[PDB]
Amino acid sequence: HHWGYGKHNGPEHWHKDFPIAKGERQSPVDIDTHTAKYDPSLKPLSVSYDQATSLRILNNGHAFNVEFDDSQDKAVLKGGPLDGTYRLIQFHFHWGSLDGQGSEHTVDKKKYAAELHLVHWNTKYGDFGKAVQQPDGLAVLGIFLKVGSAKPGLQKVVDVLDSIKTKGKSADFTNFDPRGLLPESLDYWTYPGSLTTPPLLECVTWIVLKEPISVSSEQVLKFRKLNFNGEGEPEELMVDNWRPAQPLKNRQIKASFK
Ligand SMILES: N#Cc1ccc(N(Cc2ccc(OS(N)(=O)=O)cc2)n2cnnc2)cc1
Ligand SMILES: [Zn+2]
Ligand SMILES: [Zn+2]
Q1: 114, 104 contact by CB (below 8 A)
Q2: What structural domains does the chain harbor?
Q3: For a pocket test of ligand 1, which of 197, 200, 207 has the largest count of ligand atoms closer than 8 A to its C-beta?
Q4: What is the 3-state secondary structure of the chain?
Q5: In terms of C-beta density within 10 A (0-12 exposed, 13-18 middle, 19 or more buried), how is residue 16 classed?
Q6: Which of 124, 112, 131, 127 has the alpha carbon at shortest distance from 223?
Q7: Ligand 1 neighbour 255 (Cβ under 6 A)
Q8: Is the CB of 199 under 6 A from ligand 1?
Q9: CB distance 216 to 70 below 8 Å
Q10: Is residue 92 marked as binding?
């Protein structure tokens, strides 16, 4: 009974295998703009992706991930609420069965069509495996996707999905520049959280951008043609792979903007 996003192995059942699911700093959360607090101490985000080296794209049964070479201090994230440098290791999306839902975080209860997660790990811990065991081991940059004009930089990603439809499938995906997935502005909200899928470790400093990126309905539609299952098996479309908003508890969401 491996976890999943189904009615019988989904988010509501996760706590049985991973007790931390009911922890003090679980993600995602709803960002209440009536209560978010502007912190003038927050520094601007520093994103250096010019040396980004993508390797491949894979369907792991939970979503599709684009993996990067994090061997050298190439693509790193710093500044903002972070101390030290964080290396980019991979990115993936979460989306819905319809345009009206799909994002994990919400803003004043508003859901977006999808959410992009760029995962980075703190270099002071040596590797990703050790970083996940620390409260400040990871930094995930969350970007909302709204349906509108097409996003040029996302087309390369969308076109290759046809060849990785089933779980276990992957393809070489070199020379992809993640800079084409970023919005114009880097204003953001931040709070201490967790991974949104099991093991649900509370090792993440969440950085959610205020400005969403626009993608065409044609682009997001291709996300919905992927499958959770492996080739030669009962077909089960990959849709609604998002976790519902969790209790904020005693946490405060800070804003880098007024
Ligand atoms: N300990 C541990 C551990 C850490 C990450 C794992 N991941 C990738 C992943 C990254 C971020 C994430 O969090 S999120 N969604 O970005 O909030 C969810 C999953 N994985 C899944 N299948 N293959 C790899 C698996 C085990
Ligand atoms: Zn108000
Ligand atoms: Zn994610």
Answers
A1: no
A2: 1-258 (3.10.200.10)
A3: 197
A4: CCCCCCCCCCCCCHHHHCHHHHCCCCCCCEECCCCCEECCCCCCEEEECCCCCEEEEEECCCCEEEEECCCCCCCEEEECCCCCCEEEEEEEEEECCCCCCCCCCEECCECCCEEEEEEEEEHHHCCHHHHCCCCCCEEEEEEEEEECCCCHHHHHHHHHHHHCCCECCEEECCCCCHHHHCCCCCCEEEEEECCCCCCCCCCEEEEEECCCEEECHHHHHCHHHCECCECCCCCCECCCCCCCCCCCCCCCCEECCC
A5: exposed
A6: 112
A7: no
A8: yes
A9: no
A10: yes
DSSP lists the bridge partners of residue 106 as 30
15 tagged catalytic:
no
Q: Determine if ligand 1 sits within 6 Å of the CB of residue 195.
A: yes
From CA 179, how far away is CA 49, in angstroms rounded? 6
The residue from 34, 62, 105, 120 that is catalytic is: 62
Tokens coding 180: 């084409």
Which of 21, 23, 78, 31 has the alpha carbon at shortest distance from 208?
Answer: 31
Q: Which residue has the tokens 């991930």?
A: 65
By the 8 A CB rule, do 243 and 63 touch?
A: no
Whether the link from the prior residue into 199 is cis, omega within 30° of 0, is: yes
87 touches 121 (CB < 8 A): yes
The amino acid at 83? D
| Technique behind the model | X-ray
Residue type, 256: S
Give 231: exposed, middle or buried? Use CB within 10 Å, 0-12, 13-18, 19+: exposed
The reply to whether 94 sits in an annotated binding site is: yes
